[PDB]
Design an enzyme around this catalytic site. Structure first.
Site, PDB file in Angstrom:
ATOM      1  N   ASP A  16     -33.074 -15.384  10.381  1.00  0.00           N
ATOM      2  CA  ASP A  16     -32.621 -14.940   9.065  1.00  0.00           C
ATOM      3  C   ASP A  16     -33.744 -14.269   8.282  1.00  0.00           C
ATOM      4  O   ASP A  16     -33.877 -14.465   7.075  1.00  0.00           O
ATOM      5  CB  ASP A  16     -32.055 -16.117   8.266  1.00  0.00           C
ATOM      6  CG  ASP A  16     -31.120 -15.674   7.151  1.00  0.00           C
ATOM      7  OD1 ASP A  16     -29.915 -15.491   7.423  1.00  0.00           O
ATOM      8  OD2 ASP A  16     -31.583 -15.515   6.002  1.00  0.00           O
ATOM      9  N   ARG A  26     -35.176 -10.888   1.125  1.00  0.00           N
ATOM     10  CA  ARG A  26     -34.713 -11.908   0.194  1.00  0.00           C
ATOM     11  C   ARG A  26     -35.351 -13.258   0.506  1.00  0.00           C
ATOM     12  O   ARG A  26     -35.402 -14.142  -0.349  1.00  0.00           O
ATOM     13  CB  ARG A  26     -33.187 -12.028   0.240  1.00  0.00           C
ATOM     14  CG  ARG A  26     -32.680 -13.093   1.202  1.00  0.00           C
ATOM     15  CD  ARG A  26     -31.164 -13.136   1.254  1.00  0.00           C
ATOM     16  NE  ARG A  26     -30.620 -12.083   2.104  1.00  0.00           N
ATOM     17  CZ  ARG A  26     -30.399 -12.221   3.407  1.00  0.00           C
ATOM     18  NH1 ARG A  26     -30.677 -13.369   4.009  1.00  0.00           N
ATOM     19  NH2 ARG A  26     -29.901 -11.213   4.107  1.00  0.00           N
ATOM     20  N   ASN A  27     -35.839 -13.411   1.734  1.00  0.00           N
ATOM     21  CA  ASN A  27     -36.400 -14.680   2.181  1.00  0.00           C
ATOM     22  C   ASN A  27     -37.908 -14.613   2.400  1.00  0.00           C
ATOM     23  O   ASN A  27     -38.457 -15.321   3.242  1.00  0.00           O
ATOM     24  CB  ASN A  27     -35.706 -15.140   3.462  1.00  0.00           C
ATOM     25  CG  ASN A  27     -34.251 -15.502   3.236  1.00  0.00           C
ATOM     26  OD1 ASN A  27     -33.888 -16.030   2.184  1.00  0.00           O
ATOM     27  ND2 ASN A  27     -33.409 -15.223   4.223  1.00  0.00           N
ATOM     28  N   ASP A  53     -36.826 -19.976   3.946  1.00  0.00           N
ATOM     29  CA  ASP A  53     -35.434 -20.088   4.383  1.00  0.00           C
ATOM     30  C   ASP A  53     -35.323 -20.341   5.884  1.00  0.00           C
ATOM     31  O   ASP A  53     -34.980 -19.443   6.652  1.00  0.00           O
ATOM     32  CB  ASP A  53     -34.647 -18.831   4.004  1.00  0.00           C
ATOM     33  CG  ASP A  53     -33.148 -19.048   4.047  1.00  0.00           C
ATOM     34  OD1 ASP A  53     -32.579 -19.075   5.158  1.00  0.00           O
ATOM     35  OD2 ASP A  53     -32.538 -19.190   2.966  1.00  0.00           O
TER      36      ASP A  53
END
Lengths: 309, 7
Positions: free
Chosen positions: A141, A145-146, A159
């Site tokens: 992932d 954003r992470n 994350d």
């Protein structure tokens, strides 16, 4: 094939930390800004306390391996779990990353971000991912954003909810059905639910493209229902305006269908750090040579990266 | 809004 994981999971008392502020709230519970004060150690550690409301035993069960995973990792470019607190609602305590999400930061500060920082961020993420590969770990992932911003010069990968460990014989991880971030995934990940370190390289490529476009949406305006057909047809994300062919050449290689033809994370460290020494040459930004980037008591405060157990 | 149904 594997070595014993002698990592330590620290259990914290609720009376050990102070909650200053609420960063965000959701059905998943509320994240608190606070200070962790180890009982009688004369230290105050800025923390992020994320702890949830209506718990289902499924929810609890592996909010916990995220904690298992984060407690097992130790790298300057990876968010380390400080500890957990087993209250009525389970407490997870991590290092505070004040400037928050990297995706939001480049959208907010797109006017004052130079080529030096962008290339630095690419190196640090590459280093963090390389550490994860050494730990036989697949993130599954990786996105802008992470990646969290400790300081504008220091970012860490986070994350680990979808992260998986690989056995010694294992080379590929075969997953099961669920909602997935299609537009960041490799082709084999979308088609056959197959994941690998190289599938993260693909995802790593998209993350860079996000940064170079200062937070644009990958394949924006096109339905995810067949991103994978388009990927088969040979199309990829466009070249960001600020990107020399050199930098964009690197992104493209991460989006090769033959996963073995994709660059290893250890090589991405080299190439981007090669370009980081002459930023202007590899990223053309206007006003680049003039840009600069940089809460409660503060006498005994120590950052978590300086507090070792 | 970027987590999707995989067929």
């Amino acid at each position: 094939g594997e070595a014993p994981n002698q990592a330590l999971l620290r259990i914290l008392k609720e009376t050990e930390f102070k909650k200053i502020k609420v960063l965000g709230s959701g059905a998943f519970g509320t994240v608190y800004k606070g200070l962790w004060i180890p009982e009688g150690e004369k230290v105050k550690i800025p923390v992020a306390i994320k702890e949830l409301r209506a718990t289902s035993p499924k929810a609890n069960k592996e909010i916990l391996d995220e904690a298992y995973v984060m407690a097992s990792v130790d790298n300057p470019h990876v968010c380390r779990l400080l500890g957990i607190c087993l209250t009525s609602t389970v407490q997870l305590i991590t290092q505070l990353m004040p400037f928050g999400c990297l995706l939001d930061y480049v959208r907010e500060h797109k006017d004052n971000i130079g080529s030096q920082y962008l290339l630095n961020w690419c190196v640090q993420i590459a280093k963090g991912m390389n550490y994860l590969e050494d730990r036989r770990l697949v993130h599954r992932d990786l996105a802008a954003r992470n990646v969290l911003v400790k300081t504008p010069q220091h970012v860490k990968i986070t994350d680990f909810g979808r992260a998986k460990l690989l056995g010694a014989e294992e080379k590929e991880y075969h997953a099961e059905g669920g909602k997935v971030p299609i537009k960041w995934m490799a082709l084999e990940s979308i088609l056959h639910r197959i994941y690998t370190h190289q599938s993260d390289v693909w995802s790593y490529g998209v993350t860079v493209w996000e940064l170079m476009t200062f937070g644009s949406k990958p394949y924006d305006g096109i339905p995810a229902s067949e991103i994978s057909s388009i990927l088969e047809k040979g199309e990829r994300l466009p070249q960001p305006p600020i990107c020399t062919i050199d930098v964009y050449m690197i992104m493209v290689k991460c989006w090769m269908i033959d996963a073995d033809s994709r660059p290893k994370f250890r090589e991405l460290i080299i190439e981007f750090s090669k370009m980081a020494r002459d930023p202007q040459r590899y990223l053309v930004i206007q006003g680049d040579e003039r840009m600069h980037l940089p809460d409660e008591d503060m006498d005994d405060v120590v950052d978590a990266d300086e507090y070792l157990i | 809004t970027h987590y999707y149904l995989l067929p």
